[PDB]
Amino acid sequence: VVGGTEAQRNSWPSQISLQYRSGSSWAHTCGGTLIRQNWVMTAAHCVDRELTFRVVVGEHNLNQNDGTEQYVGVQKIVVHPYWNTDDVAAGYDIALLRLAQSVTLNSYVQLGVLPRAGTILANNSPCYITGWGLTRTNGQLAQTLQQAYLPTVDYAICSSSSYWGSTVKNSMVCAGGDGVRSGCQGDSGGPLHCLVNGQYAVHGVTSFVSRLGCNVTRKPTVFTRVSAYISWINNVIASN
Ligand SMILES: *C(=O)[C@H](O)CNC(=O)NCc1ccccc1
Ligand code: NA
Question: Which of 31, 89, 126, 195, by CA, is between 20 and 30 Å from 21?
Fold first, then answer.
């Protein structure tokens, strides 16, 4: 997250760190959202590589003992069947991870609330992106979980020529684009939390930003629109 602030330890208890095994250690690669005690929602592109993955829930600082973490292996990966790695602009950037054990819920570990199917946010709706992604284009990961205020940019504006044009689809949510605050490498797969009727829900799964940089004016961060996938999510969980 570029232009973020440090999240309070208990603000976003559904945020997870998706990590892969790297020699004798684990490396953060993406975010995700805990949606059942044994299921995580992330981006399809986060799991294109044939790696060994684990999920960390109750994580705040990637590099220090928080005293709240639970570490769990990924048992099964279900990518959206229409996902195509060489065509992120097509959409379908979403995957579900079944965890090897069911995590224990507490103030640091909670299920993410998903929007009702079909829900579209009004332009300029209040949202926060969260994650441990780069704090500058071509920078380095955050140590502590970051948040940035990223109001939505509706489809009409987002798909206009000076924004993303044809690259953005109605199956996506755009947010931000102010040139200061943005998602960035390592935030992918994580949540966009939006306040609706007094309650935060996870409306987006972080998918992409500009090849030119993270915080680029009129290139808002683009997210998979969770409310487009409710039936798919329910279908996967019910058959697995
Ligand atoms: C998931 O985290 C995202 O896909 C992140 N994407 C980027 O951060 N892309 C911008 C970028 C700029 C310069 C070099 C590499 C990537
Ligand atoms: Na930690």
Answer: 89
Quote the CA–CA distance of 83 and 175 in Å, as a whole number: 22
* Cα 235 to ligand 1 centre (Å): 31
- DSSP β-bridge partners for residue 108: none
| φ and ψ at residue 196, rounded to 5 degrees | -135, 125
Q: Is 157 helix (H, G, I), strand (E, B) or coil?
A: helix
CB atoms within 10 A of CB 60: 24
What's the Cα-to-Cα distance from 49 to each of 52, 53, 62, 85, 135, rounded to whole Å? 9, 10, 21, 10, 24
Q: Residue 140 CB: number of other CB atoms within 10 A?
A: 11
Work out whether the CA dihedral 21, 35, 147, 127 comes out positive or negative.
Answer: positive
Which residue has 């760190």 as its token pair?
17
Q: How was this structure determined?
A: X-ray
Compute the distance between CA of residue 216 and CA of residue 210 in angstroms, rounded to an integer: 7
- 50 annotated ligand binder: no
93 is an active site residue:
yes
What is the CATH class of 13-111+228-240? mainly beta
Q: Where in the chain is the domain with CATH 2.40.10.10?
A: 1-12+112-227, 13-111+228-240
Annotated catalytic residue, options 60, 93, 193, 207: 93
Q: Is 86 a catalytic residue?
A: no
3-state SS, residue 240? coil
CATH class of 1-12+112-227: mainly beta
203 catalytically annotated = no
Nearest residue (CA) to ligand 1, atom 4? 208
Please tell me the distance between residue 137's alpha carbon and the centre of ligand 1 in angstroms: 8
